[PDB]
Subunit: 211 residues, 6 copies
Amino acid sequence: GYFYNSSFRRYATLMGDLFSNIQIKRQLESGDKFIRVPITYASKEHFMMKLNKWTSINSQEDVAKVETILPRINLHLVDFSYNAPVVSQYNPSPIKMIYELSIFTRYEDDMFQIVEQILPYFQPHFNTTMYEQFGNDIPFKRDIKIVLMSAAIDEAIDGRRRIEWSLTFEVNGWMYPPVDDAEGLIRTTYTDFHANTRDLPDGEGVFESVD
Amino acid sequence: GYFYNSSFRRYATLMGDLFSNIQIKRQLESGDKFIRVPITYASKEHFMMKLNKWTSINSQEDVAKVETILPRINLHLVDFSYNAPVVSQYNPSPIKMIYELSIFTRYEDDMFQIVEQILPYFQPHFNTTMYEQFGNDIPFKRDIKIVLMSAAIDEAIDGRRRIEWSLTFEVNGWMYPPVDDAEGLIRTTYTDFHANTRDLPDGEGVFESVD
Amino acid sequence: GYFYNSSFRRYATLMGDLFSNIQIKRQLESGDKFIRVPITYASKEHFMMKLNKWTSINSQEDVAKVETILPRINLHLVDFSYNAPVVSQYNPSPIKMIYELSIFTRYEDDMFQIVEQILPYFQPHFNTTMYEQFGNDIPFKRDIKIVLMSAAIDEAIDGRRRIEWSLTFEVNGWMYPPVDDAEGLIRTTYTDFHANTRDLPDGEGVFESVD
Amino acid sequence: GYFYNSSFRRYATLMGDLFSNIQIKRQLESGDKFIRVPITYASKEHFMMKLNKWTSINSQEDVAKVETILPRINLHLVDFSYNAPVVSQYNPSPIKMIYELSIFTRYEDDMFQIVEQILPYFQPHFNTTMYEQFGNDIPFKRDIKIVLMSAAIDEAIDGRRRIEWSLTFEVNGWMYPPVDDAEGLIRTTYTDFHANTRDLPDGEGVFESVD
Amino acid sequence: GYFYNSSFRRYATLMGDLFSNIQIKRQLESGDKFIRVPITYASKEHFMMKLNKWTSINSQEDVAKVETILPRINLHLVDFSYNAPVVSQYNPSPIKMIYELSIFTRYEDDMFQIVEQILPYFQPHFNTTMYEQFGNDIPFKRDIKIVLMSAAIDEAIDGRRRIEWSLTFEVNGWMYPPVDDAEGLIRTTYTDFHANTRDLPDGEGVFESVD
Amino acid sequence: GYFYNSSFRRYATLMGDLFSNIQIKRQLESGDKFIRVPITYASKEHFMMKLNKWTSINSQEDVAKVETILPRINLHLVDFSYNAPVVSQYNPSPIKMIYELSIFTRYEDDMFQIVEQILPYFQPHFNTTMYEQFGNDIPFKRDIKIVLMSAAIDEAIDGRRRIEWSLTFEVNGWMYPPVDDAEGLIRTTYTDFHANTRDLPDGEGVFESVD
């Protein structure tokens, strides 16, 4: 029920999965608890609407169930353009994609931990080699440059309430016409922030559903 | 009831027809269904008005027939200017025309499919050779450069509701004074995204009528 | 009841008259009908007010009489400045005058026809030699460059309603102090869009009255 | 009841007087009537307030007296700055003064007449030699350059009503500390638009009082 | 009740005092009256509040009293920044300070007089040597350049009412850490608009209290 | 209950502590009283809301306790970016951090005293060498350049009421991935405005709690 080999989907999942494995430390009496930051893919307005819905105190079980919601990260595509350096598709087209990575947090410390886990890997760019194999052929080698373009710090108060920092990223990637899922599912690998060659998980696995 | 040989009409139809034959795959229980994206030519404000009129659930048969409406594409001219590099018409005038191609979709996946079918052919430009023959004379050969200028991503929510992406295109074309339909209908051919020589269909054939 | 030899008047009429003789083809049951596009000289705000007064369906004999109103063209001066390349007047002062030519239309087709009759003659400029003779002396030869600067496309809806495209033109002309109508009326000729030497008609002849 | 030798006052009067002597022809049956355009010096907002006060139909004795009010010209200073090319005053300081000259008119024809009498003398500048004599000493020779910087066209409707064009002028003049009226009144002459050496009239003669 | 040796205070007082001694001539029947223009140091908003408070007619004794309030001058610091050309304080730090000098007046004539007394001494700059002696040591010589940056003309009406012109000045001065008033009071002299060496009056002497 | 070795935290504390020790002189009859200006770390809006909560005169016990609140300083991070001049962390990444230092005060004199204690040490930059030791290893030497970028002056009145000046600072520092507190606590020293090597106090000591 979705175009599996979509190039946009692959870039969405790649970006999401780079930021999928981020935890914050939270000290308890019995001991330190490390919690994973759940990440979604959605238009920002959408996400924020639904976030205002979850954070709403409707009953007594909600009062507690409120601090499990934050911290979180929302991801979205916000712009793209041709990337000015016989047919077209591997050899493919140099495209350039703009992503907003929106971190939301109830505690400045939460934010500090998270961003400290992101920010140092972009100087200002972070390279990743991606391998996309078609059926059983030799995989393709796509050089992917991800550039940290800017950051934006903001709040939204009520008495605490909610800290929001947004990073903007430029992916220098590759576009080509759709290759039907029926012609075979694309196998994809990439190098993470430590040059560790992870293989790209399916979409359904990286993003929690806002729905 | 229209000036058939209109230069503007030909550019509207040319653009509309390049993007006329775009389908999205939609996986069903019985098997995959492929649906064509219907295309219109209209002022954007107009299109959106009539679209809000259609999207309104008036009766029970409308509730279903709503997701037959989307996806669609609306096309319009939004600007033109002289294209700065004895009488005038073949030799004609280098003109430059600005088109807004507006894709509306209920599902991110629909969008991904469509744009992946448009975007790779503009690097940033796409050439097409056009042949316009007058009655039975030797056809004229007009070199047409179409350049992808920018993209713009947006929403418009209600609880799903509607994704809207707009591509802006610069057509580098040719203008000349009207040649009366009474002097004979122009025969028009062109090269598509695959250098395949289709001949330009009548207006009534490419655009579904917003009316 | 007006300064006949007014320099501004002469430019208003010249511009008005270049665009005075434009017809659109309108296919009927009995056969093709050609209708002339009527031109007025007025402040834009004004013109649109009176146009909203005329187009308002107050009654039934109006219901029909509404589609005789459109299409039309309103012309106006909007800016002027010294034209940086013993006393003053022939030898006169190089002035530069800015005109807004506003085309209004109920049908996209009407617009296409009209503008296709304007646009090809400005690449980006259109020359005209003007001859202004004083009484019976040797006429003066003023070289007039008219440059097409920009275009602007708009609507104004209600259920159709009205298409509005405005061209902006830079006339590079000549200014001098007023020469009394009592010293004799100035004779003026010019070369039209086909370099055919028409002579400049009186104001009352070119523009229908907005009043 | 005012500092007669005021430098600001002198420039205000020079400017007003260059534009003091302007008439429009107004054709009647009995014969042509020439009317002088009255000029005032006032903040623009002020002038327009009082002008809305005069033009209001309070009675029938007012109804006639309305078309004697327009046309008029309001003049005002709107900016000044040092003019970047032992003590201070002749030798004096190069200053630069900015004037808004505002023409108001009930008929486009009136405007054409007035502005046609102003505009051709600024190409883009108009020089005037000014002679300022102290008591009986040798007059000082101040070269004054007046530059037409821009023009601005506007209306203000009610059913006719009122045309407003504003010229902006850069006077390149001279400033020095105040020379008391008790030390003797300055004698001032200048060259008009025709190099005719008029001598600068007292303020009260050039400007009608808005008060 | 204040840090007497404050560097900011010294610059505020220096500026205030250059403009402390400005009078306007006011011709009366009995004879000419010269009135000194009172100067305050305050935030512009503040000053205007209190000015509206003074100018308000609450009783009959106010009616007369009210027309003595204008003319006046309000002064304030509005910006500062480092002034780009072993420890720090004589040798001290080149700072640059921005002052708004705001002249308010009921009569154009009053304004003309005042500004004619300010404006000519800035071409565009006015130099002044300042001497700050510590206890009994050799005085320090600080070169102070004051530059006239821009001017701004405005009104505020009611039936007269009030003229407001503002000069903006860049003082190129010197900052250093605070030298306690207990370590001895700094003695300060400077050169006025005529290179005449006045010594800096205490704050309380230059500015009338807005409080 | 916070990531002690957080880099953002260290820079917040470094900045806060350079400005931790600022006093103003306040003359009493019994003798001069020196009061330390308290510093907080908070988003500006937050600080201002809570400041409006403290400044509200609710009772008589509140009326006195008003002038103990001011003066104060609020500090916050407002922007950051890569600082464009085998793995990453000491060797670490050149980052650039933007801080808004907001000084609030009831008296101009208070402001003058404070800012005079800050401003002279930034010409436009101030260097500090920081030593960060991990457990017991050899310290790291991070060169920290703090640049004064701009200042901004404002009020907020009610009859006095409150002066607000804001300095903006560019810290040219260093980022690296989080080093767990469990791996040992970081020891930090730095050179203050006088090259005095103080050691960085814990967060809890520098900032008063806004909560």
